[PDB]
Amino acid sequence: PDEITTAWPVNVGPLNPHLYTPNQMFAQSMVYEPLVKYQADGSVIPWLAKSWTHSEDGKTWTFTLRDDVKFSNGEPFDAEAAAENFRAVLDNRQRHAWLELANQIVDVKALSKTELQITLKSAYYPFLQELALPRPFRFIAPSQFKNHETMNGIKAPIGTGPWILQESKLNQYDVFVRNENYWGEKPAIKKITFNVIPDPTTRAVAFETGDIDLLYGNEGLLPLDTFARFSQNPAYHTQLSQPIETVMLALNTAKAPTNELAVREALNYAVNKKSLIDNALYGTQQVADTLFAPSVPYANLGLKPSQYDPQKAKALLEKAGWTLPAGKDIREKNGQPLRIELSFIGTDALSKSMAEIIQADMRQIGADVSLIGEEESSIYARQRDGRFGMIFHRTWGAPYDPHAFLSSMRVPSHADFQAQQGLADKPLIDKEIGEVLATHDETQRQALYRDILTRLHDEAVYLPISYISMMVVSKPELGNIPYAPIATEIPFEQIKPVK
């Protein structure tokens, strides 16, 4: 085949390269390209920029751009187009706060058609890695700006990438076709249709009926019982990647009773994670003992796991004054029950399943977990504002983990800051996060990452649950389906049915 049909829970969005919801990162990465491209080994390679140099102080960077690249509408890609894109992004600077590069860029100038100069306020180390991300530093034809901006919308979603949006129908589908005037390698696939299918069971059904050819996504892609069955079905092809990121609970250090270190530590001994994974996730994921897997850059630190040990969990609670009243299973301290609210998306069957398991495990150690299932909007508002006891949370995968995930812990309107807000050493943690991003002493960088991650582990801010994987279900005719280096991209241009 050379046309494929796949599915996504939502439309790809209007494909503004510089904005977030409702734009889907993997679709922005199909159409728009970066100056430099992220590789699985952590390095970046030349992409729209063929080479670059930086000053001694590491604050000014000069990129030599390819001179052969056109936007899909035939307009040239050049340093002036790149500079206008940076201006457009930075004109919306406060929206990009989570990403420190957006706070670092002082100036971007086209010195010629091929020479682009970027100036930073400090020697920001993850500079190239952050240019490599799906958004916001990718390039739309400046003719498609609205009043010379993108923050208020764009006209046509015109990029330089291997795919061109053909058409979109809200709540129905999106169709992409191969860019026949692409500067790089031509994809084998000519057309990709995304059917919008919000429900994981309905996605599985669409595959079983032959309505779609490919499903690609994280642990939520389809029911995991069904995935296991599909993996044994000789008519189908399935894949499970190596783990890409962590799923955890975040505990609110500023809200009783999770404001108590002893409570947070006890919760971290109460969960048999292997059992949770075998029960709710059909044995398809890996147990997580730490916020970052030991395979994550800077995170191989010999941190001590809190292995499942309910006797220890009870002892920790007892020592902190949380004891069991006569005839009750829920602990009390100073008259107050040990009660914790777990908020999650109520219509997410998998979240609900894990929440039930967590509630059951915590009851065994005398903690009453109240399950609060709400719509997505409500849950995001709770995370932003710290209106939670516990929430499900995930890290962001490569290349965000650890530097960008850490960077964002400093932003008050995000779950991580909110979960951490009650820690006495939060200011120090935030100071050290600032310092790691700017340091060029590798020894100091490692020490800072060690200290930040060690404090977060030792303070039991998180309850890591699983390192989750990408999964794929496909018609055999499509062949082996590759994974992209960036956890949030889907490498459709690497699919090659005919070898």
Ligand X SMILES: O=C(O)CN(CCN(CC(=O)O)CC(=O)O)CC(=O)O
- For ligand X, the binding residues (CB under 6 A) are 20, 98, 135, 396, 400, 408, 414, 488
Torsion of CA 149, 150, 153, 155, to 10 degrees: 80
How many binding residues for Cl ion (CB under 5 A)? 6
Smallest distance from Cl ion to CB 282, Å = 8
Q: What is the C-alpha separation between 26 and 84, in angstroms, rounded?
A: 23
Torsion of CA 28, 49, 42, 123, to 10 degrees: -110
For 128, 145, 161, the CA distances from 59, given in Å and listed in that order, are: 13, 29, 29
Query: 442-458 vs 426-438: helix axis angle to the nearest 10?
Result: 150
Tell me which of Cl ion, ligand X, none is bound by residue 98, counting a contact when its beta carbon lies within the kind-specific cut-off of 5 to 8 angstroms.
ligand X
Q: Is 21 in the site for Cl ion (CB under 5 A)?
A: yes
Q: What is the C-alpha separation between 275 and 282, in angstroms, rounded?
A: 10
Indicate the residue among 469 and 474 with the shorter CB distance to ligand X.
469
Tell me which of Cl ion, ligand X, none is bound by residue 414, counting a contact when its beta carbon lies within the kind-specific cut-off of 5 to 8 angstroms.
ligand X
Q: Is 328 in the site for Cl ion (CB under 5 A)?
A: yes
Indicate the residue among 246 and 488 with the shorter CB distance to ligand X.
488
Q: What are phi and psi of 155, to 5 degrees?
A: -95, -105
DSSP 472-494: EEE-GGG---PPPSSTT---GGG
Smallest distance from Cl ion to CB 341, Å = 17
Q: What is the C-alpha separation between 303 and 492, in angstroms, rounded?
A: 38
Query: 261-270 vs 310-319: helix axis angle to the nearest 10?
Result: 160
Report the residue from 175, 256, 330, 438 that binds Cl ion according to the rule CB under 5 A: 330
Smallest distance from ligand X to CB 178, Å = 25
Contacts 24+ apart (CB under 8 A), 191-195: 191/2, 191/3, 191/4, 191/166, 192/3, 192/4, 192/5, 192/6, 192/163, 192/492, 193/3, 193/4, 193/5, 193/6, 194/6, 194/7, 194/8, 194/11, 194/12, 195/5, 195/6, 195/7, 195/8
Q: What is the C-alpha separation between 224 and 220, in angstroms, rounded?
A: 8
Indicate the residue among 135 and 178 with the shorter CB distance to ligand X.
135
**Three-state SS at 145:** strand
Smallest distance from Cl ion to CB 59, Å = 30
Query: 224-232 vs 200-208: helix axis angle to the nearest 10?
Result: 20
| Span from 20-28, 52-60, 459-467, 470-478 in contact with Cl ion (CB under 5 A) | 20-28
Smallest distance from ligand X to CB 489, Å = 11
Indicate the residue among 150 and 408 with the shorter CB distance to ligand X.
408
**Number of residue whose CB is nearest ligand X:** 98
Smallest distance from ligand X to CB 129, Å = 13
Indicate the residue among 223 and 399 with the shorter CB distance to ligand X.
399
Q: Is 329 in the site for Cl ion (CB under 5 A)?
A: yes
Which are the contacts of 319, defined by CB distance < 8 A and separation ≥ 6?
262
Smallest distance from ligand X to CB 135, Å = 5
**Number of residue whose CB is nearest Cl ion:** 231
> Which residues are registered as beta bridge partners of 394?
247
| Span from 68-76, 229-237, 372-380, 468-476 in contact with Cl ion (CB under 5 A) | 229-237
Smallest distance from Cl ion to CB 52, Å = 31
Indicate the residue among 419 and 473 with the shorter CB distance to Cl ion.
473
Structural contact between residues 392 and 419, judged by C-beta atoms closer than 8 angstroms: no
Tell me which of Cl ion, ligand X, none is bound by residue 231, counting a contact when its beta carbon lies within the kind-specific cut-off of 5 to 8 angstroms.
Cl ion
Tell me which of ligand X, Cl ion, none is bound by residue 135, counting a contact when its beta carbon lies within the kind-specific cut-off of 5 to 8 angstroms.
ligand X
Amino acid (1-letter code) at residue 360: A
Indicate the residue among 134 and 257 with the shorter CB distance to ligand X.
134
Smallest distance from ligand X to CB 124, Å = 17
Q: What are phi and psi of 233, to 5 degrees?
A: -85, 115
Tell me which of ligand X, Cl ion, none is bound by residue 328, counting a contact when its beta carbon lies within the kind-specific cut-off of 5 to 8 angstroms.
Cl ion
Tell me which of ligand X, Cl ion, none is bound by residue 417, counting a contact when its beta carbon lies within the kind-specific cut-off of 5 to 8 angstroms.
none
Tell me which of ligand X, Cl ion, none is bound by residue 380, counting a contact when its beta carbon lies within the kind-specific cut-off of 5 to 8 angstroms.
none
Indicate the residue among 294 and 412 with the shorter CB distance to ligand X.
412
Near Cl ion in 230-289, by CB under 5 A: 231
Smallest distance from ligand X to CB 414, Å = 5
Give which of 286, 275, 344 is closest to 470, Cα–Cα.
286
Q: What is the C-alpha separation between 267 and 310, in angstroms, rounded?
A: 9
Q: Is 315 in the site for Cl ion (CB under 5 A)?
A: no
Q: Is 97 in the site for Cl ion (CB under 5 A)?
A: no
Residues that bind Cl ion (CB under 5 A): 20-21, 231, 328-330
